[PDB]
């Protein structure tokens, strides 16, 4: 119908007319409209069949389909793709037909296949690794969660060693300890670390305002990236603020620091092995930065991580928690799904602003400023000082 | 956004003005817009988190939350629902926040909870049973598919006894034989059978024109519903054509005929126990009807089912296959996802019109007429005669 074609045109034109945050708001609206207008049968069909996407993405990734199609200059037949990738012809035709129906590839008028936006995404190593993590790590924990909760008469989960994870992978270890003994998972996790989220806190963080008159003299630390992974925050800080003095220090475990060396600048960023369960060695830094760290820990462990930093602080030192700050009400699926997943796997939780302030108060900290940098799903740099 | 409220108003007004087929077209367009507009990170988040929906629906079902909320007259607090249903209060608060974010319930401005469209759907026994089936039968088979295809170097799956199912449930039994040994699963399937799809073939089936001069004496059957389940097709036939002569006969296995009795009219429809893997007892029927039967069998078994019927047929007899008829190209997610699920669990497949005609020719049948009754996902009554 011309009506459907016109709806598509108007929504694309409105999407192009706004920014990434406007487009995120439109996408959530489109989802809310689908759910509101689907029939009861459609609801069950959707819940039944949308689980297919991750499995079929896992297969495409195993075959190298997404990478191959992303490099192809012309439409490919199912036959050409099957013979090239070493797949049964009929299986490849069925997988491609399914993939086209969910835009994981596109199907042409003459029943050939080209890259979509999603083909290209699943071709990117860091994003492919996310999809692989969802299949091998998240799926099993969600599959265990209902019977786990039933067996245990619906407990409030508060312990990383007593959640669905232990049922899912038949172990008494917490997720973090268990992953160390699984080379396949560590390799994928290693690739997942290379994905850099955009935008980042530096888009809205008023660094010069937050600095005040803080002196890098004689030899003080500007920024200590605690569990900084590949040190994207350190790299982006040095890139945005090349003239601000002070040590910029990436802190992580030796294997992650080794992985980071390749892509770290040759000067200006220190690689310091540090376990964030031990006292913070760098004294009187301006910013102690924790990005997507504390959300992976229940309150007891998150508190201990903060308590390990507080004694290193000057009056001018700030702890900067860069993490999810879902609202009190009307939280979006991306903030609320993450909460169920980290409950199931890690025994942890998403925290509202009030819950972040209650946690930080136990560590003797007070919130000075909160700088949101994503919308409508809230990620913010929360700036904490000594009480 | 005023923009988002405006899009919702426009789509809702266009949705209300069209019919169910028009709303299904709009819904498919909103999905495609969503995928096309998505960022690479959104794609991975969606694939990571959308499978939460089934796990959380299953937990809500276990707690009886959806039936409870559907019968509440006023908005309920998380604490009221947790206390009433026997759930940890923090667990219940988090589940409800997640459910509200995906419209499985509605959250009020007061942070209390009411029934949405989806909470009513998940309270309907037949539809709840569809969601439990997705969780306990489909999820494990989709979980097994990628590694099963990898280990076996991407075979064309062709055998019910050799597909993802056997790896998922650690068995050499086919799905149908295995399910029959599992009481809780058998019980869920019987509730699943109580769901009647709408619309149905009688909306576009020109019965009078197909009958022509056909006569019901001596004691001939107008309609034999082979695997008719609750016998909804028999009920609708007798409701729509109450004065058309000829016996109307529900065929299924004894336990399903037993379950059908309470819903069946007192006269006009015979309950005849009959295994459709055995020779058809009713001779010279006008219509031998197979609704959503053959798609659950690979060609070899589907052919055996048809070959059990053909010897009972007159020149006036028709086999009516009422089933999915996906197009040669541009097939929708609801008819390609089904294909991947039935490949994985049953070793079967969706069939294009031409694939149905090829199968039916091997049984000595030729397509007389094809009567579509759903759009844009094709279900049709295909009328076959002896060739
Ligand atoms: C979500 S990942 C990367 C987060 C990083 N801040 C970012 O935003 O790119 C969490 C990081 O914590 C690190 N990590 C885990 N346990 C740690 C520990 N005990 N001490 C220090 N780093 C740790 C991991 O190696 C990983 O790089
Ligand atoms: C998809 S379900 C119901 C389909 C039904 N025609 C309808 O549209 O409602 C398949 C039906 O086949 C029945 N069935 C399964 N195996 C059977 C067999 N060997 N003989 C007869 N009926 C069988 C089941 O009991 C069930 O009612």
């Amino acid at each position: 119908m011309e009506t459907v074609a016109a709806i598509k045109t108007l929504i694309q034109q409105l999407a192009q007319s706004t920014d990434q945050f406007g487009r995120a708001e439109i996408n959530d609206a489109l989802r809310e409209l689908q759910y509101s207008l689907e029939t009861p049968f459609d609801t069950v069909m959707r819940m039944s069949l949308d689980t297919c996407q991750v499995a079929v993405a896992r297969i495409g990734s195993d075959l190298g389909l997404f990478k191959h199609l992303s490099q192809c200059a012309s439409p490919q037949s199912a036959e050409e793709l099957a013979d090239h990738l070493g797949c049964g012809r009929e299986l490849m035709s069925r997988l491609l037909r399914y993939m086209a129906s969910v835009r994981m590839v596109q199907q042409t008028d003459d029943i050939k296949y080209i890259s979509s936006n999603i083909t290209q995404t699943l071709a990117v190593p860091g994003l492919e690794a996310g999809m692989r993590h969802a299949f091998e790590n998240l799926w099993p924990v969600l599959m265990a969660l209902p019977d786990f909760l039933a067996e245990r008469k619906y407990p409030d989960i508060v312990d990383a060693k007593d959640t669905a994870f232990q049922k899912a992978f038949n172990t008494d270890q917490d997720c973090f300890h268990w992953l160390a003994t699984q080379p396949t998972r560590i390799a994928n996790f290693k690739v997942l670390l290379t994905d850099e989220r955009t935008p980042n806190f530096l888009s809205t963080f008023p660094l010069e305002k937050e600095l005040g008159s803080w002196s890098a003299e004689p030899e003080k630390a500007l920024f200590v990236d605690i569990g900084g992974g590949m040190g994207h925050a350190c790299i982006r800080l040095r890139e945005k603020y090349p003239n601000q003095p002070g040590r910029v220090i990436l802190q992580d475990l030796p294997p992650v620091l080794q992985a980071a060396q390749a892509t770290l600048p040759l000067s200006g960023i220190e690689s310091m092995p540090h376990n964030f369960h031990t006292p913070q060695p760098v004294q009187g830094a301006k910013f102690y930065f924790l990005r997507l760290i504390l959300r992976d820990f229940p309150d007891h462990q998150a508190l201990e991580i903060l308590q390990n930093i507080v004694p290193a602080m000057d009056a001018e030192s700030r702890i900067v928690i860069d993490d999810g700050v879902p609202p009190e009400k009307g939280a979006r699926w991306a903030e609320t799904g993450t909460d169920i997943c980290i409950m199931s796997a890690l025994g942890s939780k998403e925290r509202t602003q009030r819950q972040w302030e209650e946690l930080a108060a136990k560590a003797g900290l007070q919130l000075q400023a909160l700088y949101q940098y994503t919308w409508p799903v809230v990620n913010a740099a929360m700036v904490f000082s000594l009480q």
Side-chain angles (χ1 to χ4, degrees), chain A:
Chain A
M1 222 296 166
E2 197 155 18
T3 289
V4 154
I7 291 172
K8 289 186 175 232
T9 294
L10 284 223
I11 299 284
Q12 331 255 32
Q13 280 313 118
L14 291 167
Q16 279 177 45
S17 82
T18 196
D19 63 359
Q20 64 175 134
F21 306 125
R23 282 189 287 282
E25 282 265 17
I26 293 167
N27 258 27
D28 280 5
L30 294 175
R31 204 171 267 249
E32 202 222 352
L33 277 170
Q34 286 169 66
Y35 295 169
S36 82
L37 296 161
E38 73 190 5
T39 67
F41 178 85
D42 286 350
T43 296
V44 173
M45 197 65 148
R46 157 174 75 78
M47 283 180 192
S48 289
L49 297 186
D50 279 359
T51 129
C52 283
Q53 293 201 34
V54 183
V56 168
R58 233 307 288 273
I59 293 161
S61 165
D62 290 341
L63 281 167
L65 171 66
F66 298 126
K67 277 146 185 177
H68 173 61
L69 201 45
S70 276
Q71 135 265 99
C72 286
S74 67
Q76 309 292 108
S77 72
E79 294 63 42
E80 289 170 331
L81 288 167
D83 304 340
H84 178 85
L85 297 167
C87 192
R89 253 149 109 301
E90 172 100 306
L91 173 60
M92 178 67 88
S93 189
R94 295 175 68 190
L95 287 172
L96 288 163
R97 284 177 197 282
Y98 170 75
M99 283 176 193
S101 74
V102 291
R103 209 204 167 67
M104 226 183 280
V105 305
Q106 300 184 264
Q107 181 191 79
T108 68
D109 260 318
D110 54 333
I111 321 189
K112 305 185 193 301
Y113 297 90
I114 64 180
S115 273
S116 66
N117 57 312
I118 292 165
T119 314
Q120 296 284 351
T121 297
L122 290 176
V124 170
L127 291 165
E128 171 186 51
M131 175 278 290
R132 296 183 66 87
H133 161 74
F135 181 87
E136 70 193 40
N137 299 327
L138 298 183
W139 264 27
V141 161
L142 293 175
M143 293 185 67
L145 177 69
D147 288 340
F148 174 73
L149 291 182
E151 273 152 34
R152 283 287 302 280
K153 305 303 248 69
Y154 299 94
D156 292 350
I157 300 178
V158 295
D159 179 11
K161 272 157 52 281
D162 195 20
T163 189
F165 179 82
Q166 281 79 32
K167 177 199 176 75
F169 289 107
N170 188 226
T171 175
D172 46 22
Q173 305 186 263
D174 57 23
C175 178
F176 290 138
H177 281 225
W178 182 80
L179 275 180
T181 101
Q182 312 283 326
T184 252
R185 318 218 165 219
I186 293 309
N188 189 70
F189 242 40
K190 172 164 159 158
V191 175
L192 179 50
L193 252 205
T194 68
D195 184 53
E196 187 179 357
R197 284 167 60 138
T198 190
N200 72 66
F201 79 109
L202 291 167
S203 64
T204 70
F205 193 77
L207 185 121
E208 286 202 272
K209 185 188 194 281
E210 280 290 340
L211 256 201
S213 298
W214 179 85
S215 177
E217 287 189 66
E219 207 180 71
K220 278 150 95 212
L222 175 56
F223 194 85
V224 181
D225 192 4
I226 302 176
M230 297 298 95
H232 301 136
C234 292
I235 296 173
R236 295 300 184 193
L237 174 74
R238 284 296 201 208
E239 176 187 56
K240 194 150 227 290
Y241 293 101
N243 293 3
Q244 285 290 348
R247 296 171 71 196
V248 171
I249 302 159
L250 166 60
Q251 284 178 351
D252 212 297
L253 303 186
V256 174
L257 291 192
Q258 190 284 319
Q261 295 316 118
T263 45
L264 270 183
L266 263 132
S267 69
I269 304 177
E270 283 172 61
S271 289
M272 187 176 293
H274 175 56
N275 186 322
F276 53 49
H277 294 297
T278 66
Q280 173 49 240
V282 178
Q283 305 303 302
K286 179 59 200 175
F287 305 120
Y288 296 99
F289 184 82
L290 294 162
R291 181 159 74 195
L292 291 180
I293 301 306
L294 292 190
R295 77 126 195 243
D296 282 349
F297 296 91
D299 283 1
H300 179 83
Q301 289 194 84
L303 176 50
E304 290 175 334
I305 294 172
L306 289 176
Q307 287 174 328
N308 279 319
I309 296 159
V310 165
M313 295 174 78
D314 290 354
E316 278 191 284
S317 294
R318 297 297 185 268
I319 292 179
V320 182
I321 301 173
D322 176 344
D323 213 310
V325 192
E328 289 283 326
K329 73 182 205 202
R332 309 289 182 124
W333 63 266
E335 309 177 285
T336 226
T338 49
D339 183 68
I340 298 313
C341 286
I342 66 188
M343 190 192 273
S344 298
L346 308 180
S348 65
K349 69 201 245 47
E350 293 276 32
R351 297 176 173 97
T352 68
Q353 184 186 317
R354 293 178 71 83
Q355 291 171 332
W356 281 122
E357 293 191 66
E358 173 60 14
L359 176 65
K362 290 176 179 151
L365 298 163
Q366 58 167 323
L367 179 69
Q368 294 292 343
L370 187 156
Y371 306 110
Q372 190 166 345
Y373 65 90
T374 66
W375 296 263
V377 166
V378 189
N379 294 92
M382 290 169 285
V383 178
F384 290 92
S385 75
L386 290 173
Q387 263 160 17

